[PDB]
């Protein structure tokens, strides 16, 4: 019932228990952006886990970028002064009515529908 940003997934695969508890705090049918998928899969190749990381990611609902999301991303970038991939993920969460779970307080604080589960 929630969308997860790249940073948490990276933390998970990197062995942070904090990330494990972030995912467990939300019910299955958890979603990620196709961007997050690509960003994570890049790390999988570097650490040579590509096959097993893919099977783990495939348990997530993986949301591609519609033009709905494209339109919203453009708007959100101006409104919230966001980097574009941040905007696309935020747009993805909004249109599917999901809460955005992210470690980024800097950019996303003060934006409704955003939850920062942990810091360090």
């Amino acid at each position: 019932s929630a969308l997860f940003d790249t940073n948490i997934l990276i933390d998970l695969f990197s062995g942070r228990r904090e990330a494990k508890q972030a995912l467990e705090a939300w019910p299955p049918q958890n979603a990620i952006s196709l961007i997050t998928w690509m960003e994570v899969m890049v790390g999988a190749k570097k650490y040579h886990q590509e096959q097993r990381t893919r099977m783990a990611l495939s348990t997530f609902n993986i949301i591609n970028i519609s033009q709905d999301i494209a339109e919203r991303s453009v708007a959100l970038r101006q409104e919230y002064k966001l980097k574009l991939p941040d905007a696309i993920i935020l747009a993805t969460a909004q249109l599917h009515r999901l809460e955005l779970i992210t470690r980024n307080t800097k950019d996303f604080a003060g934006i409704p529908g955003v939850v920062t589960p942990y810091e360090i």
Partner: peptide, 30 residues
């Protein structure tokens, strides 16, 4: 009966434990 309940409870957990299995296997994978 219900008994429609309790077959709600499962399948309601897991789901929540492939999830736990998926997550736990994913932790420190790299």
């Amino acid at each position: 009966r219900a008994e429609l309940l309790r077959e709600a409870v499962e399948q309601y957990l897991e789901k929540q434990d492939r999830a736990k299995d998926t997550i736990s296997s994913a932790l420190g994978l790299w």
